[PDB]
Amino acid sequence: KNAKAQLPDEVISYINDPRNDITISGIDNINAQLGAGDLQTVKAAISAKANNLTTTVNNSQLEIQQMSNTLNLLTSARSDMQSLQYRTISGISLGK
Amino acid sequence: YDLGSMSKDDVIDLFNKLGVFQAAILMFAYMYQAQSDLSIAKFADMNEASKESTTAQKMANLVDAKIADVQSSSDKNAKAQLPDEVISYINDPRNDITISGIDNINAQLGAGDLQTVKAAISAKANNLTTTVNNSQLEIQQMSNTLNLLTSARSDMQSLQYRTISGISLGK
Amino acid sequence: YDLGSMSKDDVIDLFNKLGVFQAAILMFAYMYQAQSDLSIAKFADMNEASKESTTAQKMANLVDAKIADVQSSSDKNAKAQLPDEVISYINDPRNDITISGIDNINAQLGAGDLQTVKAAISAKANNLTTTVNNSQLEIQQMSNTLNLLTSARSDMQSLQYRTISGISLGK
Amino acid sequence: YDLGSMSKDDVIDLFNKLGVFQAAILMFAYMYQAQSDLSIAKFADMNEASKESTTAQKMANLVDAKIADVQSSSDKNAKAQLPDEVISYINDPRNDITISGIDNINAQLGAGDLQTVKAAISAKANNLTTTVNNSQLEIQQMSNTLNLLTSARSDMQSLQYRTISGISLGK
Amino acid sequence: YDLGSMSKDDVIDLFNKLGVFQAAILMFAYMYQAQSDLSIAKFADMNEASKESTTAQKMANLVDAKIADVQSSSDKNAKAQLPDEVISYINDPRNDITISGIDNINAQLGAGDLQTVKAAISAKANNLTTTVNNSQLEIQQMSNTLNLLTSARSDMQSLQYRTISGISLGK
Amino acid sequence: KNAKAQLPDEVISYINDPRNDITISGIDNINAQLGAGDLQTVKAAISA
């Protein structure tokens, strides 16, 4: 009914960090027994941490528009002084 | 994310980092989790009242095999012993019969001993109109709101899309 | 930049330095900040009404472990003590039961003592249809306008681009 | 380029070499890769719940060939053996039947043995309204944002063109 | 904002500042507040008629403990004193019994003294079919309109959104 | 839960100048505790 599989705590005990938390007792290599209550809730908590993507498009989409529009203006203003510089000097003929 | 351990002002420091819309979905998904945990815990108690019956009427069929052997014999009473390996589950949190010492007495009265152990043990198995009577009002109040807690979360997930999708970079 | 401390005529001295378009975005971003602070503070109160439930039904499971030990014994009442280390959280801003002195009495009545402490403490956990009833009108009025305050700010940020981009130096 | 191994300040040394626009596309293409890896891993679990059905109802057709041979005979029960080479896949992580030792007993009851092995094994195959119920909210939230992550990347790729195309060498 | 103190022409100076739509929601929210204050005040009077019963039948159980002690003794009448610390709440706005001076007389007649103090005090506790009879017509008229006052306010809050959302700045 | 990091006030107390302002109490080397409410709003003001 339960096969006593130990967790790969060499990686999956990275929970002891700035991380999430599970409301289950002492975890360290207990030969995790409940495939429906122990192993099925460590994944169902650790994967809901991985849904942090619609929150970063929501937060930073207004300011990216305001800071990418002006970069198109700061290139195209510099590329116009570099042209007016050419036609200013190129009309000056030495001697002639 | 659990919110059963956090303080109030800590949660506001979690919502401001999240933005306004992801605050709302985390508010409704935590509201949906607690009602869904409440209703499933309610369905567990009703299922015990059914599980207590499918073992109850199971034993009553086993006594009926012994009434098939008492009556079919030539004598007035055939001395059939009870299957006490299962049917002496009465010595438990259970019912009770007002008949003397039961344990493997080669049960003699097909009309007074075997006919009343079944007629008591099967009336224990009628515990079903009492659980529909008790839990039908509260199931209505806790299933109607689940239709509201899904359909409120599915509307913030749409307003989230049309809020951002009107923002065109450059253009 | 905060505008909750400034006077009115000082803000006009801040807008004229900024130009017309950057005035508008600072007007809408401050309008967006105050509505977003208002709604998240509203979601905090609804989340307390859910957080008050996930501790409420947690304790009711703990009393059900003791009803599993009262009834399963051989005697009529098994003298199970309450887990008062948690379940005497009733001495707080909480509910109340009309039963005498509770503290570790080896709770005897599985049908009258343990069956009514849970049946009171779990009806405290039904505080969820009352918060959807109260806060569903105002959430609509404060989420519709956030879709307008984003989409007004994202239009000034575009008109700002096409205003300046038609200006060619030299040429 | 992987960004799951790099440190933060190393990535800024990768962005400054790249320029501003190629920084943005590498930011969105890595954001698109992780959401697409998340959703396909979600669709894998739903497909296992369908793959568990197309083998389940496959075996139930095989028991129906044996009910075609039990009933069609002249005797009251025709002694058809089960195709245990496949249908004894029950000895696995599977379901269970409350009937005695099954292995090639020349299954006799077309109404009580063969009619309940199918009626149990086919009710295992109804696991489809439970997966649409569970995963329809989260599929909406993870498919709406993919339409945003494509259409944000396709706008930086256009602003990149019109930024450089206005630069004429010489002229 | 209160409108129970303002004059009529002052309120029109409050509506014109507000605009047309915010005028309408403040008109319906004040209409919703007064009906909700009316109905809750109506439910308070019905709850007093129930609260007057749960103390009434509580005392009748206390007299039944004394009838358990009068009859169980060997004498013809056991001289049980009333619990006058609670059951002499009759000296109040209450009922009345046509029996002489009551105060701690070691109540002798289990059939004529203790059997009529309960049979009077419990017929006071039957005041429940009279409150459903009186307040069932008016509860229908005041609950139907609350469904209309919510659903009128939730329609102005939507027309408000689609009025402004079609206005695109610049473009 | 909070590691008590002091601010580099040798530079970051340049706020006491013609500058911006934060609506948070007395700042000077308090071993800044809230990574989400103290350190997360001094940057979110100074970068805007």
Name the β-bridge partners of C107. Answer: C80
Identify from B161, B162, B167, B168 which residue to disrupt to test chain D contact, counting D C-beta atoms within 10 A and taking the largest count: B161
**How many independent structural domains does chain C possess?**
1
- DSSP letter at D89? T
Which CA distances in Å does B60 have to B27, B83, B108, C107, C116? 51, 11, 17, 35, 33
Q: Are the CB atoms for B19 and B156 separated by under 8 Å?
A: no
Chains E and A touch (3+ CB pairs under 8 A): no
CB contact under 8 A, A73 and C170: no
Please report residues of F whose CB lies closer than 8 A to that of C1.
Answer: 20, 48
- Is there a domain that residue D34 lies in? yes
Q: Are the CB atoms for E39 and E47 separated by under 8 Å?
A: no
Residue among C137, C144, C152 minimizing CB distance to E153: C137
Q: What is the DSSP string of D20-80?
A: HHHHHHHHHHHHHHHHHHHHHHHHHHHHHHHHHHHTHHHHHHHHHHHHHHHTTSSSS---B
Chains B and D touch (3+ CB pairs under 8 A): yes
Please report residues of B whose CB lies closer than 8 A to that of A69.
Answer: 169-170
- Is there a domain that residue D4 lies in? no
- DSSP letter at E80? B
Chain B: residues touching F (Cβ < 8 Å): 10, 13-14, 17
The dihedral region occupied by D156, where left means phi > 0, alpha psi between -120 and 50, and beta the remainder, is: alpha
- Is there a domain that residue B157 lies in? yes
Task: Round to whole Å and give the CA distance between D109 and D116.
Answer: 9
The burial of D139, by beta-carbon neighbours within 10 Å (0-12 exposed, 13-18 middle, 19 or more buried), is given as middle
Q: Are the CB atoms for C40 and B20 separated by under 8 Å?
A: yes
- At A11, is the secondary structure helix, strand, or coil? helix
Chains touching chain C through at least 3 C-beta pairs below 8 angstroms are A, B, E, F
- Is there a domain that residue E5 lies in? no
Residue among B23, B34, B163 minimizing CB distance to C128: B34
Chains D and E touch (3+ CB pairs under 8 A): no
CB contact under 8 A, A57 and D162: no
Q: Are the CB atoms for C169 and A77 separated by under 8 Å?
A: yes
Provide the H-helix boundaries in chain A: 9-12, 39-46, 54-59, 62-89
Please report residues of C whose CB lies closer than 8 A to that of E153.
Answer: 137
- DSSP letter at C107? B
Tokens for B170? Answer: 């450059």
- What value, to the nearest 5°, has the Cα angle with vertex C116 and ends C114 and C122? 105
Q: Residues D10, D12, D18, D20: what is their CA dihedral angle, to the nearest 10 degrees?
A: 170
Contacts of D47 (CB under 8 A, 6+ apart): none
Nearest to C60 by CA among C134, C117, C126: C117
- At E59, is the secondary structure helix, strand, or coil? helix
Chains touching chain F through at least 3 C-beta pairs below 8 angstroms are B, C
- Is there a domain that residue C1 lies in? no
Task: Round to whole Å and give the CA distance between A55 and B4.
Answer: 22
Q: Are the CB atoms for D118 and D60 separated by under 8 Å?
A: yes
**Amino acid at residue number D6:** M
Residue among D20, D24, D166 minimizing CB distance to A76: D166
- At D93, is the secondary structure helix, strand, or coil? coil
- Is there a domain that residue C82 lies in? yes
Tokens for E170? Answer: 């610049």
The experimental method behind these coordinates is: cryo-EM
CB contact under 8 A, C53 and B38: yes
- Is there a domain that residue D101 lies in? yes
CB contact under 8 A, B3 and C57: no
Q: Are the CB atoms for D88 and D105 separated by under 8 Å?
A: no
CATH number of D159's domain: 1.10.287.1140
Contacts of B16 (CB under 8 A, 6+ apart): C40
Please report residues of B whose CB lies closer than 8 A to that of D133.
Answer: none
Q: Work out whether the CA dihedral D58, D62, D68, D70 comes out positive or negative.
A: negative
CB contact under 8 A, F48 and C2: no
CB contact under 8 A, E165 and C148: yes
Please report residues of A whose CB lies closer than 8 A to that of D156.
Answer: 68
Q: Are the CB atoms for E17 and E85 separated by under 8 Å?
A: no
- Is there a domain that residue B88 lies in? yes
Tokens for E26? Answer: 């403040």
Shortest Cα distance, chain D CAs vs residue B164, angstroms: 8
Domain extent at residue E133? 10-169
